[PDB]
């Protein structure tokens, strides 16, 4: 499914280049250009373990998520993937626990060690 294609296809993105978080581009952005760090971004996304339960979909509630890029508001893996979309890019995320929950995890939804996958669109960026 989506996790083993990019298990199988997809980029590591990382500088450590450890795999930690691999991406596939599925719809290239009209956008020419990457957000700078600092900028709000503004996304859509679908989040699943690696095994495919899906954990949580901003268009439940059409509500983009937004943060502050590079600030570390969230997860490692959303921090180094979405500075490489382009705006109106759909890309898929795999993403090892050091570059989301951790062996803390974030139960209910995220056990301990889980890699996780996300479906991310990057609708917008603005200025800080």
């Not at 083993?4 to 997809?10: D, F, L, S």
């Not at 009209?30 to 095994?51: A, C, F, Q, R, W």
């Not at 921090?79 to 951790?102: R, S």
């Amino acid at each position: 499914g989506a996790p083993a294609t990019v298990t199988e296809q997809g980029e590591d993105i990382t500088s450590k280049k450890d795999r930690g978080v691999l991406k596939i581009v599925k719809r290239v952005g009209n956008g020419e250009e990457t957000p700078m760090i600092g900028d709000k971004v503004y996304v859509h996304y679908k989040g699943k373990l690696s095994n495919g339960k899906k954990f949580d979909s901003s268009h439940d509630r059409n509500e983009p998520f937004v943060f502050s890029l590079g600030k570390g508001q969230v997860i490692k893996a959303w921090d180094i993937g979405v500075a490489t979309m382009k705006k109106g890019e759909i890309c898929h995320l795999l993403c090892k626990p050091e570059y989301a929950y951790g062996s803390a995890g974030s139960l209910p939804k995220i056990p301990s060690n889980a890699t996780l996958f996300f479906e991310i669109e990057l609708l917008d960026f603005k200025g800080e």
